[PDB]
Amino acid sequence: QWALEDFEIGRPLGKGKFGNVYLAREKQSKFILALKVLFKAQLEKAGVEHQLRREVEIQSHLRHPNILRLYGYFHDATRVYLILEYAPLGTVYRELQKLSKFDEQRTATYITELANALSYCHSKRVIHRDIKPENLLLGSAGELKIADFGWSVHAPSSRRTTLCGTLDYLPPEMIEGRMHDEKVDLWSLGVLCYEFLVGKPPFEANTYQETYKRISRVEFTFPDFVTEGARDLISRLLKHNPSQRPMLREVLEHPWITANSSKPS
Template sequence: MAIATETQPQQHKDSSEVSGSAAEQRRWTLNDFDIGKPLGRGKFGHVYLAREKTSNHIVALKVLFKSQLQQSQVVHQLRREVEIQSHLRHPHILRLYGYFYDQKRVYLILEYAPKGELYKELQKCKYFSERRAATYVASLARALIYCHGKHVIHRDIKPENLLIGSQGELKIADFGWSVHTFNRRRTMCGTLDYLPPEMVGECRT
């Protein structure tokens, strides 16, 4: 994926999922979507509820600003995120249907998880029942086993990056730190609050 300043929007399109026409070859643009309410905000942009006009399929549209990506030197991470997540197919992994971009922004077309972050759900409930917590842990474990079978390491599992679908099912999201590798990695990355003790120990030695 090129993150450049082309005037013509580009895209990668899984048309069988969003538009309903596997033969359709036209490129996505912002005009293909009705934009709804904001769903969240991140370091490099915002996420909006959106509807693909042709199919009426509801998605989450993640809008990232190129200038901020380039300034933070994370363009390569975005390329890797798109490449990895767009090829993952698992009921407990959030789908990335495709992307497109224009002169100023990059747009990721994501599966919509209507019940939001696990983190916010936990804040609201204070604690989960043993049965509910066990269901989430089992779902997460199955998704991670699938990822590792594909030689993908997420590297930033935390409640904020776990979303809840319409049926209450867990979905891993945000593959910004993920890598495709056959080897063990020692990169210091992820979120400081969730670093495992063994990684903290290695950093201090």
């Protein structure tokens, strides 16, 4: 139903081994949006092909203000095209490299939007498993949207598929191939809260091996400027036992969150 013919392609929003994201405009309506264009070639010659199926099937059926919408898709036997809501203010990744760290009001707000978004996903038993600054996009009023559902599945789940990138955001159950569930995204949330305030993930190391160890041991420390309420929220989320991690309601209602945040639940 859609095809490339319907779009003008603008400036790239991301480039990589498998393809690119483009700013794009639909020709008949002038609707501006993003096109995530993957090379079939590389998805197959990599073993990611099934993930594109789940990314589309899951994201397309989610509707939430803090979830980046997927409007549709098409292909053309060289490439696949994901038709994405365009996020004008970029990534939290870029925001973080810009300001180095975030203040407590801004951190707590981003977390609230995250937990609201995950609340809705966990309602549909959908787990993201790839929550990280590169996949947090900023809407036109600066509000956070979760994007990139390549790693999302329905919970519970195992991991047959290979963990290719950094481990900084993944919980112990996931780096070890165990069965995992919604609590995966809660660990990630605490990683993010920490990174937002400190400027680097709480388990960053020089090697994948060292990083893996620090995650397995839950081995992180706070720089002295991190306050007691943040220390408390982070420590409660970064628990080895997934069952000990809170529910999202306890996060949205954490005192430090409600004090410093501006957005509601």
